[PDB]
Design a protein around this motif. Structure first.
Motif, short mmCIF file in Angstrom:
data_model
loop_
_atom_site.label_atom_id
_atom_site.label_comp_id
_atom_site.label_asym_id
_atom_site.label_seq_id
_atom_site.Cartn_x
_atom_site.Cartn_y
_atom_site.Cartn_z
N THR A 151 29.02 12.71 -15.86
CA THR A 151 28.52 12.67 -17.25
C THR A 151 29.28 13.45 -18.18
O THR A 151 30.28 14.16 -17.83
N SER A 152 29.05 13.21 -19.60
CA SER A 152 29.77 14.02 -20.59
C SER A 152 29.24 15.35 -21.05
O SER A 152 28.20 15.45 -20.91
N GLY A 153 29.72 16.15 -21.94
CA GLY A 153 29.25 17.46 -22.50
C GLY A 153 29.12 18.13 -21.34
O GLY A 153 29.75 18.15 -20.24
N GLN A 154 28.31 19.19 -21.55
CA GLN A 154 27.98 20.38 -20.78
C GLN A 154 27.19 19.65 -19.40
O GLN A 154 26.13 18.83 -19.75
N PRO A 155 27.65 20.07 -18.37
CA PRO A 155 26.68 19.60 -17.11
C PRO A 155 25.23 20.34 -17.27
O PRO A 155 25.24 21.41 -17.57
N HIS A 156 24.33 19.64 -16.60
CA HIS A 156 23.16 20.04 -16.81
C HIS A 156 21.99 19.72 -15.46
O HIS A 156 21.96 18.55 -15.13
#
Lengths: 49, 49
Positions: free
Chosen positions: B39-44
């Motif tokens: 996924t994009s952005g910060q991993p969560h």
């Protein structure tokens, strides 16, 4: 807390009565009062040549 | 006067068990069908914080 996992397998081979070739021998009727019915009868009148 | 815990402790789900789930999905999912591991952005990670 950490978990132990298991897998479910869900696929099945669906079958239907009306799609079957055996259904050709049948005449399929729904009758939602069948619990009340005891015996169904069908009577014939024939005179010979 | 003594400082004491105001409330009970919480159930916390270990971050590691996400890896086990992803490995199971790697085995079970279709070819290149699984996409939650990237996924994009910060991993969560799913969490109750």
């Amino acid at each position: 807390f950490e978990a132990i996992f298991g897998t479910f397998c869900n696929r099945l081979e669906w079958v239907y009565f009306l799609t079957s070739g055996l259904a050709a021998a049948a005449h399929a009727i729904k009758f939602h009062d069948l619990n009340k019915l005891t015996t169904g009868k069908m009577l014939f009148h024939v005179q010979v040549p | 006067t003594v400082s004491a815990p105001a409330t009970y402790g919480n159930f916390v789900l270990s971050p590691e068990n996400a890896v086990t789930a992803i490995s199971y999905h790697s085995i079970l999912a279709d070819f290149n069908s699984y996409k939650a591991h990237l996924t994009s952005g910060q991993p969560h990670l799913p969490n109750d914080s």
